[PDB]
A paper describes a structure:
[name] (FDH), which is composed of a small N-terminal domain (Nt-FDH) and a large C-terminal domain, is an abundant folate enzyme in the liver and converts 10-formyltetrahydrofolate (10-FTHF) to tetrahydrofolate (THF) and CO2. Nt-FDH alone possesses a hydrolase activity, which converts 10-FTHF to THF and formate in the presence of β-mercaptoethanol. The N-terminal hydrolase domain of FDH (Nt-FDH) binds folate and is homologous to glycinamide ribonucleotide formyltransferase (GART) and methionyl-tRNA formyltransferase (FMT), enzymes that are crucial for de novo purine biosynthesis and translation initiation, respectively. In this study, we determined crystal structures of zebrafish wild-type apo Nt-FDH (zNt-FDH) and its ternary complexes with the substrate 10-formyl-5,8-dideazafolate (10-FDDF) and the products tetrahydrofolate (THF) and formate.
The catalytic mechanism underlying the hydrolase reaction is also suggested based on comparative analysis of the zNt-FDH [name] mutant and the structural alterations associated with substrate and product binding. Phe89, Arg114 and Tyr200 are highly conserved in FDH from all species. The activity assay shows that the hydrolase activities of the F89A, R114A and [name] zNt-FDH mutants decreased significantly in comparison to that of zNt-FDH_WT. As expected, the [name] mutation decreased the enzymatic activity by ∼62%, preventing us from examining the kinetic properties of the mutant FDH. We co-crystallized or soaked crystals of the mutant ([name]) with the product THF, but we observed no clear extra electron density in the active sites of the structures. Our results suggest that Tyr200 might play a crucial role in the release of products. Finally, from our structures, we have identified a new key residue Tyr200 that might be involved in product release, product inhibition and additional THF binding.
Residue numbers in the entry: 1 to 308
Write the structure that this text describes.
Protein backbone atom coordinates (compact mmCIF):
# COMPACT_ATOMS: atom_id res chain seq x y z
CA UNK A 1 0.00 0.00 0.00
CA UNK A 2 0.95 3.68 -0.26
CA UNK A 3 2.61 4.79 2.96
CA UNK A 4 3.82 8.13 4.29
CA UNK A 5 6.41 7.78 7.06
CA UNK A 6 6.09 10.67 9.51
CA UNK A 7 8.83 10.67 12.12
CA UNK A 8 12.58 10.34 12.62
CA UNK A 9 15.53 8.49 14.22
CA UNK A 10 17.21 5.20 13.30
CA UNK A 11 14.01 3.48 14.40
CA UNK A 12 12.07 5.50 11.84
CA UNK A 13 14.75 4.57 9.32
CA UNK A 14 14.42 0.83 10.01
CA UNK A 15 10.61 0.90 9.80
CA UNK A 16 10.93 2.73 6.47
CA UNK A 17 13.43 0.16 5.22
CA UNK A 18 11.44 -2.90 6.28
CA UNK A 19 8.13 -1.61 4.84
CA UNK A 20 9.88 -0.80 1.55
CA UNK A 21 11.37 -4.29 1.52
CA UNK A 22 7.90 -5.77 2.07
CA UNK A 23 6.80 -4.22 -1.21
CA UNK A 24 4.99 -1.17 0.16
CA UNK A 25 5.22 2.09 -1.77
CA UNK A 26 6.65 4.86 0.39
CA UNK A 27 5.15 7.97 -1.22
CA UNK A 28 6.80 10.37 1.20
CA UNK A 29 8.95 10.79 4.29
CA UNK A 30 8.15 13.69 6.60
CA UNK A 31 10.86 14.32 9.17
CA UNK A 32 12.64 17.06 11.13
CA UNK A 33 14.87 19.79 9.63
CA UNK A 34 18.64 19.50 9.65
CA UNK A 35 20.28 20.42 12.95
CA UNK A 36 24.05 21.08 13.10
CA UNK A 37 24.22 20.01 9.45
CA UNK A 38 23.25 16.43 10.28
CA UNK A 39 20.44 14.91 8.20
CA UNK A 40 18.10 12.55 10.03
CA UNK A 41 18.73 8.84 9.24
CA UNK A 42 15.17 8.56 7.91
CA UNK A 43 15.87 11.30 5.38
CA UNK A 44 19.22 9.77 4.37
CA UNK A 45 17.78 6.38 3.38
CA UNK A 46 14.76 7.90 1.63
CA UNK A 47 16.95 10.18 -0.50
CA UNK A 48 19.17 7.20 -1.43
CA UNK A 49 16.03 5.46 -2.72
CA UNK A 50 14.68 8.58 -4.45
CA UNK A 51 11.64 8.69 -2.16
CA UNK A 52 10.50 12.32 -1.64
CA UNK A 53 11.78 13.85 1.61
CA UNK A 54 10.01 16.65 3.48
CA UNK A 55 11.48 18.62 6.38
CA UNK A 56 8.77 20.87 7.83
CA UNK A 57 9.86 23.11 10.74
CA UNK A 58 6.19 23.17 11.80
CA UNK A 59 2.80 21.97 10.53
CA UNK A 60 0.80 24.51 12.49
CA UNK A 61 1.02 28.26 13.08
CA UNK A 62 -1.03 29.96 15.82
CA UNK A 63 -3.29 26.96 16.34
CA UNK A 64 -4.08 26.60 12.64
CA UNK A 65 -2.65 24.14 10.13
CA UNK A 66 -0.36 25.72 7.55
CA UNK A 67 -2.22 25.08 4.28
CA UNK A 68 0.91 25.15 2.10
CA UNK A 69 2.53 22.27 4.03
CA UNK A 70 -0.73 20.28 4.41
CA UNK A 71 -1.15 20.54 0.63
CA UNK A 72 2.37 19.19 0.04
CA UNK A 73 1.50 16.31 2.37
CA UNK A 74 -1.85 15.56 0.71
CA UNK A 75 -0.26 15.47 -2.75
CA UNK A 76 1.81 12.33 -2.11
CA UNK A 77 -1.46 10.39 -1.81
CA UNK A 78 -0.73 8.20 1.20
CA UNK A 79 -3.13 5.37 2.03
CA UNK A 80 -1.69 5.13 5.55
CA UNK A 81 0.51 7.27 7.77
CA UNK A 82 3.12 5.47 9.85
CA UNK A 83 4.50 7.47 12.81
CA UNK A 84 7.76 6.15 14.34
CA UNK A 85 9.05 8.53 17.04
CA UNK A 86 7.34 11.57 15.54
CA UNK A 87 8.52 14.53 17.62
CA UNK A 88 6.35 16.95 15.66
CA UNK A 89 2.75 18.01 16.22
CA UNK A 90 0.66 16.56 13.41
CA UNK A 91 -2.69 18.25 12.55
CA UNK A 92 -5.74 15.96 12.56
CA UNK A 93 -6.24 17.00 8.93
CA UNK A 94 -3.07 15.01 8.21
CA UNK A 95 -3.68 12.18 10.69
CA UNK A 96 -7.12 11.46 9.18
CA UNK A 97 -6.30 12.13 5.51
CA UNK A 98 -5.34 8.63 4.30
CA UNK A 99 -8.02 5.95 3.79
CA UNK A 100 -6.53 3.95 6.69
CA UNK A 101 -5.66 6.99 8.80
CA UNK A 102 -2.51 6.74 10.92
CA UNK A 103 -0.78 4.26 13.22
CA UNK A 104 1.76 5.21 15.90
CA UNK A 105 4.55 3.23 17.59
CA UNK A 106 4.57 3.70 21.35
CA UNK A 107 7.25 2.14 23.60
CA UNK A 108 5.03 1.27 26.56
CA UNK A 109 2.10 -0.98 27.40
CA UNK A 110 -0.74 1.48 26.81
CA UNK A 111 -2.72 2.74 28.58
CA UNK A 112 0.24 2.94 30.98
CA UNK A 113 2.91 5.60 30.32
CA UNK A 114 1.27 7.82 27.74
CA UNK A 115 3.72 10.52 26.69
CA UNK A 116 6.98 11.03 24.82
CA UNK A 117 9.35 9.55 27.43
CA UNK A 118 7.50 6.30 28.15
CA UNK A 119 10.69 4.21 28.18
CA UNK A 120 12.18 6.51 30.83
CA UNK A 121 9.08 6.34 33.03
CA UNK A 122 8.77 2.56 32.64
CA UNK A 123 12.14 2.36 34.41
CA UNK A 124 11.81 5.35 36.75
CA UNK A 125 8.70 3.71 38.21
CA UNK A 126 10.54 0.38 38.42
CA UNK A 127 8.02 -1.56 36.34
CA UNK A 128 8.63 -5.32 36.11
CA UNK A 129 7.12 -5.59 32.62
CA UNK A 130 7.47 -3.24 29.65
CA UNK A 131 6.95 -3.41 25.90
CA UNK A 132 5.37 -1.48 23.07
CA UNK A 133 2.04 -0.75 21.45
CA UNK A 134 1.05 0.03 17.88
CA UNK A 135 -2.15 2.09 18.04
CA UNK A 136 -4.45 4.07 15.76
CA UNK A 137 -3.90 7.82 16.15
CA UNK A 138 -6.80 9.87 17.44
CA UNK A 139 -6.97 13.55 18.50
CA UNK A 140 -5.65 12.84 22.01
CA UNK A 141 -2.13 12.00 23.14
CA UNK A 142 -1.44 8.26 22.90
CA UNK A 143 -5.15 7.62 23.55
CA UNK A 144 -6.17 5.85 20.33
CA UNK A 145 -7.36 2.24 20.09
CA UNK A 146 -4.81 -0.56 20.19
CA UNK A 147 -3.90 -2.49 17.04
CA UNK A 148 -1.29 -4.73 18.70
CA UNK A 149 0.85 -4.95 21.83
CA UNK A 150 4.00 -6.90 22.77
CA UNK A 151 5.56 -7.42 26.20
CA UNK A 152 9.05 -7.93 27.60
CA UNK A 153 10.55 -8.35 31.06
CA UNK A 154 12.28 -5.32 32.55
CA UNK A 155 15.62 -6.34 34.05
CA UNK A 156 16.63 -4.91 37.46
CA UNK A 157 19.55 -2.97 35.95
CA UNK A 158 18.05 -2.14 32.56
CA UNK A 159 18.66 1.44 31.48
CA UNK A 160 16.91 3.23 28.59
CA UNK A 161 19.57 2.10 26.11
CA UNK A 162 19.61 -1.59 27.12
CA UNK A 163 15.86 -2.26 27.04
CA UNK A 164 15.57 -0.22 23.82
CA UNK A 165 18.38 -2.11 22.08
CA UNK A 166 17.29 -5.53 23.41
CA UNK A 167 13.55 -5.39 22.77
CA UNK A 168 11.74 -2.11 22.05
CA UNK A 169 13.73 -1.34 18.88
CA UNK A 170 14.07 -4.65 17.01
CA UNK A 171 10.69 -6.04 18.07
CA UNK A 172 9.15 -2.61 17.61
CA UNK A 173 10.24 -2.61 13.98
CA UNK A 174 8.70 -6.07 13.51
CA UNK A 175 5.49 -4.99 15.24
CA UNK A 176 5.11 -2.02 12.88
CA UNK A 177 5.65 -4.25 9.84
CA UNK A 178 3.16 -6.75 11.23
CA UNK A 179 0.63 -4.01 11.95
CA UNK A 180 0.73 -2.77 8.35
CA UNK A 181 0.41 -6.37 7.17
CA UNK A 182 -2.79 -6.76 9.23
CA UNK A 183 -4.10 -3.46 7.85
CA UNK A 184 -3.34 -4.39 4.23
CA UNK A 185 -4.81 -7.87 4.58
CA UNK A 186 -7.78 -6.11 6.14
CA UNK A 187 -8.04 -7.63 9.62
CA UNK A 188 -6.33 -5.20 12.02
CA UNK A 189 -8.43 -4.63 15.17
CA UNK A 190 -9.27 -1.42 17.04
CA UNK A 191 -9.22 -2.32 20.73
CA UNK A 192 -10.34 0.64 22.85
CA UNK A 193 -7.76 1.31 25.55
CA UNK A 194 -9.03 0.16 28.96
CA UNK A 195 -9.48 2.88 31.59
CA UNK A 196 -7.77 0.95 34.37
CA UNK A 197 -4.02 1.45 34.47
CA UNK A 198 -3.94 4.61 32.36
CA UNK A 199 -1.08 6.96 33.26
CA UNK A 200 0.54 9.90 31.51
CA UNK A 201 3.91 11.44 32.36
CA UNK A 202 6.00 14.39 31.22
CA UNK A 203 8.85 14.56 28.71
CA UNK A 204 12.28 13.96 30.25
CA UNK A 205 14.77 16.77 29.59
CA UNK A 206 18.12 17.56 31.21
CA UNK A 207 16.49 20.19 33.43
CA UNK A 208 13.91 17.83 34.95
CA UNK A 209 16.21 14.81 35.25
CA UNK A 210 17.98 16.36 38.23
CA UNK A 211 18.34 13.79 41.02
CA UNK A 212 16.09 14.19 44.04
CA UNK A 213 18.23 12.79 46.88
CA UNK A 214 15.44 12.41 49.47
CA UNK A 215 14.43 8.97 48.19
CA UNK A 216 15.38 5.39 49.11
CA UNK A 217 18.35 3.84 47.27
CA UNK A 218 16.12 1.74 44.99
CA UNK A 219 14.15 4.76 43.75
CA UNK A 220 17.41 6.63 43.06
CA UNK A 221 18.67 3.59 41.16
CA UNK A 222 15.47 3.61 39.09
CA UNK A 223 15.80 7.36 38.50
CA UNK A 224 19.38 7.10 37.26
CA UNK A 225 18.82 4.06 35.03
CA UNK A 226 15.55 5.53 33.76
CA UNK A 227 17.44 8.58 32.45
CA UNK A 228 20.56 6.73 31.23
CA UNK A 229 21.82 7.62 28.72
CA UNK A 230 19.39 10.36 27.80
CA UNK A 231 18.91 12.91 29.11
CA UNK A 232 21.25 11.83 31.94
CA UNK A 233 20.32 12.08 35.61
CA UNK A 234 22.53 14.68 37.29
CA UNK A 235 23.43 16.51 40.49
CA UNK A 236 25.65 19.39 41.46
CA UNK A 237 29.04 18.31 42.80
CA UNK A 238 31.67 20.88 43.81
CA UNK A 239 29.76 23.65 42.05
CA UNK A 240 29.30 21.76 38.78
CA UNK A 241 26.67 19.56 37.13
CA UNK A 242 27.72 15.90 37.16
CA UNK A 243 25.72 13.23 35.30
CA UNK A 244 25.47 9.63 36.56
CA UNK A 245 25.41 6.43 34.47
CA UNK A 246 25.52 2.68 35.11
CA UNK A 247 23.66 2.19 38.35
CA UNK A 248 23.37 -1.03 40.35
CA UNK A 249 22.00 -1.66 43.84
CA UNK A 250 24.54 -2.47 46.54
CA UNK A 251 23.51 -4.16 49.78
CA UNK A 252 26.16 -6.30 51.30
CA UNK A 253 29.74 -7.43 51.98
CA UNK A 254 30.74 -3.92 53.10
CA UNK A 255 32.71 -1.89 54.05
CA UNK A 256 35.75 -3.38 52.25
CA UNK A 257 36.90 -0.36 50.31
CA UNK A 258 38.30 2.03 52.00
CA UNK A 259 36.31 4.65 50.09
CA UNK A 260 37.23 8.27 49.63
CA UNK A 261 34.44 10.61 50.81
CA UNK A 262 32.76 12.92 48.31
CA UNK A 263 30.34 15.58 49.52
CA UNK A 264 27.24 15.89 47.35
CA UNK A 265 24.95 18.78 48.33
CA UNK A 266 21.58 17.40 49.38
CA UNK A 267 22.68 13.75 49.56
CA UNK A 268 21.45 11.93 52.69
CA UNK A 269 25.11 11.49 53.53
CA UNK A 270 28.45 11.83 51.72
CA UNK A 271 29.21 9.57 48.76
CA UNK A 272 32.19 7.19 48.59
CA UNK A 273 34.64 7.04 45.69
CA UNK A 274 35.72 3.39 45.46
CA UNK A 275 37.62 1.08 43.11
CA UNK A 276 34.31 -0.27 41.77
CA UNK A 277 32.68 3.12 41.20
CA UNK A 278 30.78 5.83 43.07
CA UNK A 279 28.84 4.59 46.11
CA UNK A 280 25.74 6.69 46.85
CA UNK A 281 23.26 6.51 49.74
CA UNK A 282 19.48 6.78 49.65
CA UNK A 283 17.44 8.26 52.50
CA UNK A 284 16.83 4.74 53.81
CA UNK A 285 20.43 3.93 54.71
CA UNK A 286 20.85 1.75 51.64
CA UNK A 287 23.36 2.01 48.80
CA UNK A 288 23.66 2.05 45.02
CA UNK A 289 26.77 1.99 42.81
CA UNK A 290 27.38 4.33 39.86
CA UNK A 291 29.99 3.17 37.34
CA UNK A 292 30.34 6.28 35.20
CA UNK A 293 30.20 10.06 35.62
CA UNK A 294 30.14 12.88 33.12
CA UNK A 295 30.84 16.61 33.34
CA UNK A 296 29.25 19.24 31.08
CA UNK A 297 29.92 18.74 27.36
CA UNK A 298 31.89 15.84 28.72
CA UNK A 299 33.39 12.48 27.97
CA UNK A 300 32.44 9.81 30.47
CA UNK A 301 34.87 8.97 33.27
CA UNK A 302 34.69 5.98 35.66
CA UNK A 303 33.24 6.74 39.08
CA UNK A 304 36.42 5.27 40.57
CA UNK A 305 38.49 7.98 38.88
CA UNK A 306 36.72 11.03 40.33
CA UNK A 307 39.75 12.40 42.22
CA UNK A 308 42.31 11.67 39.50
Amino acid sequence: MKIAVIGQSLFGQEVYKELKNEGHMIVGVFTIPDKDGKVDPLAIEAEKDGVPVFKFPRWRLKGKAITEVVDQYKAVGAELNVLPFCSQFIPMEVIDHPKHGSIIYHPSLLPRHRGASAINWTLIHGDKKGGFTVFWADDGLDTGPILLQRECDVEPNDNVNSIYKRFLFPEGVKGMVEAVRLIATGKAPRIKQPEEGATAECIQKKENSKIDWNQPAEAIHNWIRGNDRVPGAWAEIDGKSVSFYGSTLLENDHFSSNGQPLEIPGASRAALVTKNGLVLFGNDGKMLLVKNLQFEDGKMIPGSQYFK
